[PDB]
Scaffold this active site. Sequence first.
Site, PDB file in Angstrom:
ATOM      1  CG  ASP A 108      -1.973   1.019   1.309  1.00 27.35           C
ATOM      2  OD1 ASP A 108      -2.957   0.680   0.634  1.00 27.35           O
ATOM      3  OD2 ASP A 108      -1.801   1.994   1.816  1.00 27.35           O
ATOM      4  NE  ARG A 109      -0.559   6.310   0.529  1.00 25.94           N
ATOM      5  CZ  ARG A 109      -0.983   7.007  -0.782  1.00 25.94           C
ATOM      6  NH1 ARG A 109      -1.678   6.221  -1.459  1.00 25.94           N
ATOM      7  NH2 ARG A 109      -0.785   8.314  -1.003  1.00 25.94           N
ATOM      8  NE  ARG A 112      -0.140   3.842  -3.540  1.00 30.61           N
ATOM      9  CZ  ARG A 112      -0.385   3.276  -4.575  1.00 30.61           C
ATOM     10  NH1 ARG A 112       0.394   3.639  -5.627  1.00 30.61           N
ATOM     11  NH2 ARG A 112      -1.180   2.503  -4.936  1.00 30.61           N
ATOM     12  CG  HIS A 153      -9.318   5.786  -0.402  1.00 32.19           C
ATOM     13  ND1 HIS A 153      -9.884   5.132  -1.007  1.00 32.19           N
ATOM     14  CD2 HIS A 153      -7.930   5.512  -0.117  1.00 32.19           C
ATOM     15  CE1 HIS A 153      -9.052   3.992  -1.566  1.00 32.19           C
ATOM     16  NE2 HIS A 153      -7.872   4.470  -0.829  1.00 32.19           N
ATOM     17  CD1 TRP A 154      -6.357   6.390  -3.395  1.00 32.14           C
ATOM     18  CD2 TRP A 154      -4.943   6.778  -4.874  1.00 32.14           C
ATOM     19  NE1 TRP A 154      -5.211   5.341  -3.225  1.00 32.14           N
ATOM     20  CE2 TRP A 154      -4.252   5.839  -4.329  1.00 32.14           C
ATOM     21  CE3 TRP A 154      -4.456   7.616  -5.882  1.00 32.14           C
ATOM     22  CZ2 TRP A 154      -2.934   5.285  -4.641  1.00 32.14           C
ATOM     23  CZ3 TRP A 154      -3.049   6.977  -6.244  1.00 32.14           C
ATOM     24  CH2 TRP A 154      -2.482   5.919  -5.673  1.00 32.14           C
ATOM     25  CE1 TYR A 217      -4.114   7.255   1.998  1.00 34.14           C
ATOM     26  CE2 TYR A 217      -4.777   7.406  -0.368  1.00 34.14           C
ATOM     27  CZ  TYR A 217      -4.658   6.883   0.810  1.00 34.14           C
ATOM     28  OH  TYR A 217      -5.017   5.343   0.618  1.00 34.14           O
ATOM     29  CG  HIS A 278      -5.356  -3.179   0.049  1.00 33.53           C
ATOM     30  ND1 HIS A 278      -4.695  -3.010  -1.155  1.00 33.53           N
ATOM     31  CD2 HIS A 278      -5.114  -2.384   0.824  1.00 33.53           C
ATOM     32  CE1 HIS A 278      -3.866  -1.829  -0.673  1.00 33.53           C
ATOM     33  NE2 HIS A 278      -4.186  -1.457   0.718  1.00 33.53           N
TER      34      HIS A 278
END
Lengths: 298, 296
Positions: A108-109, A112, A153-154, A217, A278
């Site tokens: 997830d984050r 990234r 939510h992005w 975000y 996820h």
Amino acid sequence: DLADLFPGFGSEWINTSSGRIFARVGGDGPPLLLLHGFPQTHVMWHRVAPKLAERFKVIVADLPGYGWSDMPESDEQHTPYTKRAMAKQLIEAMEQLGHVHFALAGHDRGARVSYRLALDSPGRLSKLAVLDILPTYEYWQRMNRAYALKIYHWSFLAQPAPLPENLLGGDPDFYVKAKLASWTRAGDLSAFDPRAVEHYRIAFADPMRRHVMCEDYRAGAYADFEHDKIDVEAGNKIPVPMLALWGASGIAQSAATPLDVWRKWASDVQGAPIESGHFLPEEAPDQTAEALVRFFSA
Amino acid sequence: LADLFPGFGSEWINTSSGRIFARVGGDGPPLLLLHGFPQTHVMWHRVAPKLAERFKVIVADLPGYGWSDMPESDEQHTPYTKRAMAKQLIEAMEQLGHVHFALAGHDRGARVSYRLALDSPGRLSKLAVLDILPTYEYWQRMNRAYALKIYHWSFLAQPAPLPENLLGGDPDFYVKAKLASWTRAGDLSAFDPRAVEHYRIAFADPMRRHVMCEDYRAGAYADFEHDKIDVEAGNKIPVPMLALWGASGIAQSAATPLDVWRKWASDVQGAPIESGHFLPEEAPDQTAEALVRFFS
């Protein structure tokens, strides 16, 4: 009253120039840094890091600003919560431990941060695994009606402060539970260890922590996308052998076929779906652990 | 709560789906004014008196909004689809003896209005839509920029009760934020404070917020599907229509509004107004001027 979900792992508060990174650290062998994402903390790895720690020095860190890591003050460009920055700060943290070359799995984050790390400073990584993501650029480039609805939510969390923060503050518990639940295969919380959920919920209960998440975000909408955009328009590929794992009912697979996408970003990428929503390491811990152990052991 | 329509009566118009609240004043041809999100009919308080010099002006709360009744929704958000709202408003106009009327709508109300024009164009003498493109066009142009700009199109359409619960987190903040951020100034100074109080009070009611969400859920699903069918059959609005949009409004963030609307309407006139999204309140004189010129 948060449980210790990493029995036998130590704890480290790693100083960096941008604040202390909290990490549980266990195992021995080659260094493997595990990065969680949103709305979670390092403890989402608690089901797989033990397996990992049989073969690696496993460093299970809270992202900058998440969990018990310190929260750099953000700025108008959300700089400390851009993945570039977080990667640099995690590189610093790892250097504090003597790890200038390490394996990295992110979710997830944290994934990234990981692929940004791998684009910016590929010499730091032996191997990279990213769990249930496509690059931020790809989510944004695939942002049509169907996907805008799926990962609303992005857009929502990237609204200027204090709009998300104000709405999240009325009932933070609801939102963290809703996200946890809705991105699982089951659609509820049953995949998660309740003690883990408590960690997430407590982290989410802190307004500053929520702000940081929005900052993350916000970076995800702006600088992170810009950084990615530069690389993909420059044809910059991740040179680090990488694993792309995604949940068959996860988020990444909803935008596009993940390996096709990743082969565009990475010169040496292997990929596997996992029957999972996820939250691969909590919904599919055995499968996740085995895929990561096999990949990082090659 | 101030009366912002001095001289207008206040009617509760029965329909088969519930009551429509309206302020009604003026005389002459009927002109129905439909507000949008997150407002109510009083958004027309600066333009309506000028319209009422030449028209019977009906300033209606959309179904579910303001003081109109809230029909119970369903899994398809049926009552809050623009098709269903259009039908209910046609019924409300029929209760007044108005089967052929002029229509101007802003925002959500403009979406009812053009869906009205597509479904029942015989009902309309002329149509004005303020600061919208068709719902299909917003979703078809969905991309990063627009997703961030109209994030609430995805947010409010999330399944209940997520937006409801979030909105309940700070409703006064949200509606003022919505109102401020879509203006040219970026604050509330373009609004009459008494109008803002109308907006704030409607938005304070969770059941009212739910309906707004139902509206947006419709906007993401049925309304888009209804629009798609017209795009895909080539149906055009045959009603003379005026597209007005704010130079800094939502409609022009997606595309050049007139060229968009020319695809949807055979007879479209268009003009940018120096304003943000809330044309009748930011730019009352220019807006009223254009509407009067167009409808007369």
